[PDB]
Amino acid sequence: DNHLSIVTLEEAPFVIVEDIDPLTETCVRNTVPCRKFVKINNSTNEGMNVKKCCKGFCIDILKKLSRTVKFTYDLYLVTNGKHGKKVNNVWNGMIGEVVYQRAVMAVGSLTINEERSEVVDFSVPFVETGISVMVSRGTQVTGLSDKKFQRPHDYSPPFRFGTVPNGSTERNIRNNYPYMHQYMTRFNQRGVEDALVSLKTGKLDAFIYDAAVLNYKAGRDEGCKLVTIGSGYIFATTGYGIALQKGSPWKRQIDLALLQFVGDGEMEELETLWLTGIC
């Protein structure tokens, strides 16, 4: 069968979730149907799949892959965690959905890294990312290895910096720089919008996060005050990839289709359509 369960996760501009037109119950314009499971209450795990609509950079990629690779799909938003983290030896998030065969693939702002590649197969990266550092203009930070980050209590007052936990960026910091990691947790941000407000109002000195999302936010920042250090410099370069089950039969055609999109200039165009910044 060519009808595939596919999981995603909202993260603008890669995946943007909108309410469906209630009269028509049909998704239009550049959006596709996507459902989200929402609990009735806090006593039981009973819930309902809410019909919603999804659009964005990754959704246009999914639509093109559906056409060229020849499949249909049932797109759903993950609700057990977010991108993917191994908790007590059990992957949650989009990675977990693929590992435990609830989704044939995961399409979204899903970072390729080594530990995830041990449990899923990734397509070719379809957009470059990594780790960047966002600051308010003028804050001086040489890079991730700035000793303001590495040995923060060498400085008085110490640098205030954080990430959104449980994703690939925290995993990288935790693995590479243990003292820096344990220090940052007190500055953990609940999400990107929280972090950006914390930066703009001077409650945080730096926000360390996915490079593609940070550089998209810098390009849109009102007043162009929030910038990524270097000039959009990317540490630990990697990419977003489609996650597939290990040994998935779909990987080859997905790979070739994504590279065809590159070869025909369509990825360049998608990049310009969704990720361009005023700043």
Partner: protein
């Protein structure tokens, strides 16, 4: 011993003659480390191609030495005999360059700045990228926003831009209908080599040179010239192996690990940034 094919492409692979005793001259990087060099056999120049030992080093050689140590394999390096990266040419098309050597078994691994693309991926296995690729623009220390700048999109003789004749860039531009206007403008000004095109930017004869971003950032490390604008037509360089290779999984995992622990960034700072 895995047979590694590579190609001369600075700053990823430098190729120099051996010293008079057949060894490689001891040299050091900007960071003060010794340059690791390997002997790579290959042609010297309708003339006979005498294959001799030469000295190979750079980004890609550093990566090979890491991979070889990390994955516990031995290797011998040679330079591709016909000097080409690898395109399908008709005699029933056949792959030339490093692609043909890999597919014919003259090589077991391509370790080179080999651009990942659909045509090659139909035939061989690429790793996850060891370096992300794109085009940028080289100019005199001159603002151009990138591929969508009005002085590129609406060309005139007042702002001359070009690439290398018959290069992958030349071919790429010819292929996209939407680049027709830029292609015809470049066609009137394309240079025979990158070196000549870069010299023409210095001498105010060429206002902008469209070329590989890694090479051009390597060039801006001399500086009267600069790279400018957003990268465009991005992809990556990968290690190339045959579909059946028992190495491809661990090669690609090792590349991810080297990006994640900063090894790859160190390579960028040794060979590309300065």
């Amino acid at each position: 011993r895995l047979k590694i094919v590579t190609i001369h492409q600075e700053p990823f692979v430098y190729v120099k003659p051996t010293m008079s005793d057949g060894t490689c001259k001891e040299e050091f990087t900007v960071n003060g480390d010794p340059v690791k060099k390997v002997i790579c056999t290959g042609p010297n120049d309708g003339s006979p191609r005498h294959t001799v030992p030469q000295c190979c080093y750079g980004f890609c050689i550093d990566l090979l030495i890491k991979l070889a140590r990390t994955m516990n394999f031995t290797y011998e390096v040679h330079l591709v005999a016909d000097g080409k990266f690898g395109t399908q040419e008709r005699v029933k098309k056949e792959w030339n360059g490093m692609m043909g050597e890999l597919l014919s078994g003259q090589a077991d691994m391509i370790v080179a700045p080999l651009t990942i693309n659909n045509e090659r991926a139909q035939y061989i296995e690429f790793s996850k990228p060891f370096k992300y690729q794109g085009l940028t623009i080289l100019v005199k220390k001159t603002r151009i926003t990138g591929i969508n700048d009005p002085r590129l999109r609406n060309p005139s003789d007042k702002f001359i831009y070009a690439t290398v004749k018959q290069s992958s860039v030349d071919i790429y531009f010819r292929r996209q209908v939407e680049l027709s206007t830029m292609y015809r403008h470049m066609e009137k000004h394309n240079y025979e080599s990158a070196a000549e095109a870069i010299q023409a930017v210095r001498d105010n004869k060429l206002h902008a040179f469209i070329w590989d971003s890694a090479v051009l950032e390597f060039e801006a490390s001399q500086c009267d010239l600069v790279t400018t604008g957003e990268l465009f037509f991005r992809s990556g360089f990968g290690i190339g192996m045959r579909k059946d290779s028992p190495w491809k999984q661990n090669v690609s995992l090792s590349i991810l690990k080297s990006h994640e622990n900063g090894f790859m960034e160190d390579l960028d700072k040794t060979w590309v940034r300065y």
